[PDB]
Amino acid sequence: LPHLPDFSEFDLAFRPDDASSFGDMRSAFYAGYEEADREYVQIGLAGRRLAEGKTLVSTTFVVPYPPGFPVLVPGQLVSKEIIYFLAQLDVKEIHGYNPDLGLSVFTQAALARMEAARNAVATVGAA
Amino acid sequence: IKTAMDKAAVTWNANQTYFVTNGTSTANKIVVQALTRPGDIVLIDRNCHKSHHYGLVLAGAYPMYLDAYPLPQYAIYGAVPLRTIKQALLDLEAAGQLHRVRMLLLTNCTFDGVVYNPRRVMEEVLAIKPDICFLWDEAWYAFATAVPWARQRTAMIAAERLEQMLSTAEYAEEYRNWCASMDGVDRSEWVDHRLLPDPNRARVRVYATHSTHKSQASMIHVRDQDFKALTRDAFGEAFLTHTSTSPNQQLLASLDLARRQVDIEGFELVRHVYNMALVFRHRVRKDRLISKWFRILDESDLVPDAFRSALADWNEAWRSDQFVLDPTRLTLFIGATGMNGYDFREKILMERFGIQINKTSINSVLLIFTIGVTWSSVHYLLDVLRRVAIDLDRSQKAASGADLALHRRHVEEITQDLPHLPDFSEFDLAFRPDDASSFGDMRSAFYAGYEEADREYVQIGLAGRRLAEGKTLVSTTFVVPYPPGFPVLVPGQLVSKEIIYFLAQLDVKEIHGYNPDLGLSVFTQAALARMEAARNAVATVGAA
Numbered sequence: 129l130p131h132l133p134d135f136s137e138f139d140l141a142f143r144p145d146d147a148s149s150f151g152d153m154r155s156a157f158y159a160g161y162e163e164a165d166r167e168y169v170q171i172g173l174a175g176r177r178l179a180e181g182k183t184l185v186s187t188t189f190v191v192p193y194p195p196g197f198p199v200l201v202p203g204q205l206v207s208k209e210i211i212y213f214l215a216q217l218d219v220k221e222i223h224g225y226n227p228d229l230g231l232s233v234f235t236q237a238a239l240a241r242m243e244a245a246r247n248a249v250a251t252v253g254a255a
Numbered sequence: 256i257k258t259a260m261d262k263a264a265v266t267w268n269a270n271q272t273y274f275v276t277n278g279t280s281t282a283n284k285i286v287v288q289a290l291t292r293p294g295d296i297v298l299i300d301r302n303c304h305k306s307h308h309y310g311l312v313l314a315g316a317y318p319m320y321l322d323a324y325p326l327p328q329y330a331i332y333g334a335v336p337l338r339t340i341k342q343a344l345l346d347l348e349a350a351g352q353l354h355r356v357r358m359l360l361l362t363n364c365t366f367d368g369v370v371y372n373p374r375r376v377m378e379e380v381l382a383i384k385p386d387i388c389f390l391w392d393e394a395w396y397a398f399a400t401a402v403p404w405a406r407q408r409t410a411m412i413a414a415e416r417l418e419q420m421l422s423t424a425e426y427a428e429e430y431r432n433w434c435a436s437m438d439g440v441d442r443s444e445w446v447d448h449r450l451l452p453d454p455n456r457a458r459v460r461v462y463a464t465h466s467t468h469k470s471q472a473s474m475i476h477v478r479d480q481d482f483k484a485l486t487r488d489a490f491g492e493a494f495l496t497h498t499s500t501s502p503n504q505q506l507l508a509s510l511d512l513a514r515r516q517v518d519i520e521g522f523e524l525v526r527h528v529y530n531m532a533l534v535f536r537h538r539v540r541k542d543r544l545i546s547k548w549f550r551i552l553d554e555s556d557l558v559p560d561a562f563r564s565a566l567a568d569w570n571e572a573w574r575s576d577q578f579v580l581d582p583t584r585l586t587l588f589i590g591a592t593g594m595n596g597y598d599f600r601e602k603i604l605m606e607r608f609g610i611q612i613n614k615t616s617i618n619s620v621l622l623i624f625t626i627g628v629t630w631s632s633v634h635y636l637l638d639v640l641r642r643v644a645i646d647l648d649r650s651q652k653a654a655s656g657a658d659l660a661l662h663r664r665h666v667e668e669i670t671q672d673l674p675h676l677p678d679f680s681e682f683d684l685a686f687r688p689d690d691a692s693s694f695g696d697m698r699s700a701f702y703a704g705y706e707e708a709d710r711e712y713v714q715i716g717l718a719g720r721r722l723a724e725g726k727t728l729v730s731t732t733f734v735v736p737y738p739p740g741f742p743v744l745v746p747g748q749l750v751s752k753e754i755i756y757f758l759a760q761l762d763v764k765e766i767h768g769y770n771p772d773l774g775l776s777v778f779t780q781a782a783l784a785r786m787e788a789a790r791n792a793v794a795t796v797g798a799a
Contacts, residue, residue, distance in 0.1 A: 158292050161489050
């Protein structure tokens with residue numbers, strides 16, 4: 129039995145405090161509305177893309193219905209266990225996800241820009 | 256099921272119609288969330304349903320409050336004139352904030368009855384912002400789709416016609432001539448000039464909300480060029496946010512009975528009720544006895560000439576004129592009788608048939624001719640008015656000089672001089688992102704009022720004293736007097752002497768966020784100074 133998908137920390141671009149593990153789900157929710165900041169990556173290549181070293185940050189609430197609880201939330205660092213669980217599970221009721229187009233993920237340029245802005249804001253606020 | 260939903264879309268001439276089975280406010284908030292993002296400014300008529308204000312607060316939108324032209328004689332708000340919308344859209348352009356605006360969010364038929372012209376307002380706004388969006392609150396106008404002479408004033412039909420027009424090479428030539436005609440005219444003068452959309456850039460986007468039982472299931476009609484591109488996923492997420500599930504078969508399964516009900520028999524009853532309304536207006540207008548005291552206000556009263564311009568004349572005015580008046584929302588005026596509208600409702604009429612009475616102004620009562628109005632209702636209303644007329648005539652004939660003087664002062668006290676209506680005052684500087692424009696942060700002011708240390712309660716007399724003493728009175732919550740059920744004070748809105756005067760003379764049945772016996776929620780001086788200092792520091796930090 130593959131291990132269950134334990135929650136993976138919020139991506140560093142969406143965490144007000146880098147030390148702590150609480151994210152900013154509102155900004156991740158709205159930042160995903162954009163069309164130039166969102167990308168679709170097929171499940172079959174998510175593991176390969178992770179291997180290369182990219183940071184796959186989801187943009188939508190992935191909520192497999194029968195369990196009833198969100199596997200992924202906006203700004204969640206998609207982890208390999210979550211990839212495997214989503215690939216295995218094939219229940220037709222999955223809100224916020226589809227297996228034909230891909231898994232919504234912030235584009236690397238968008239994540240870089242957002243994290244740069246977050247770092248600047250944190251540096252300025254502390255000063 | 257999907258095919259049935261398509262049939263419903265055909266019935267309402269929309270592209271996709273979504274049913275919200277949790278009231279109309281839920282659908283309003285759904286659309287507001289789907290369209291607006293944080294920051295994105297949204298124009299809005301201040302009289303709109305308070306559900307829209309709460310939706311804006313939830314979505315963090317920066318609302319620009321458009322005000323309607325007053326009617327001091329009858330103490331009501333008519334509508335926002337297109338010139339005002341253009342003036343606002345251009346006043347933003349000076350400060351550079353015009354890119355931000357995303358929703359005009361006008362109501363389609365105000366509470367009193369005035370009807371907008373969707374096609375013209377969309378045409379004249381898409382010239383300035385060819386990618387704006389429109390949410391038409393059709394709560395009070397859902398029925399008015401069966402009658403052809405009012406069909407063309409609905410959001411969906413106007414949007415479809417606007418869509419077809421832009422794609423016609425004839426309109427291409429017309430636009431080219433129009434633009435060639437106004438070369439060399441300053442953009443700021445576009446307020447005093449008819450405008451046209453750009454055929455290539457403009458993308459019509461229209462969203463409407465219809466109550467299912469009015470022609471608590473609600474509806475959402477969508478006709479958007481970029482639905483599948485820029486709003487599909489966001490619309491689904493908002494639907495999930497404010498409803499158990501995203502659009503599914505179960506929501507659709509309910510529709511088929513409603514679609515049959517409306518497409519087979521519903522429209523006939525709407526036409527019938529419109530005939531009853533027209534007949535009733537004529538009977539009051541023509542009758543020798545009723546017309547002595549009772550006058551039903553029509554276009555010439557509620558619509559000032561400045562906004563004005565047989566069967567052909569009637570249809571042309573309803574197709575091209577700016578403001579018309581819906582027959583089925585009667586505004587009976589009783590200033591001559593000398594009795595308050597509240598007194599009239601309490602003693603004489605109230606409700607005794609399919610007719611309802613929604614609000615009762617100082618010297619009038621708004622009578623709604625709903626779908627349950629039959630000939631008997633017209634007969635009953637005419638007889639009640641006739642009996643009141645004969646009693647008043649007899650009393651006047653038997654009245655002495657003192658009694659006649661008392662009656663004259665009764666009419667004077669509620670017909671000649673009335674308190675000036677309060678307009679939106681301003682947003683407080685600490686709740687205005689950029690001081691150049693006049694939109695404010697309604698979400699920051701919303702939650703900033705939760706803090707008990709910052710908030711305080713002030714009495715009406717103390718409020719007047721403070722204003723005379725130069726102390727800003729900023730509200731902390733939605734104050735919603737409920738004659739029409741729309742807010743008077745919104746979070747952060749600066750309180751003005753007009754607001755206090757209006758609030759100081761209210762006996763309305765229901766008020767939210769108001770405790771007359773305790774005070775009024777207002778930000779403390781220190782809290783406002785702190786917030787303004789923080790905003791100024793935030794603005795200055797960008798220049799560091």
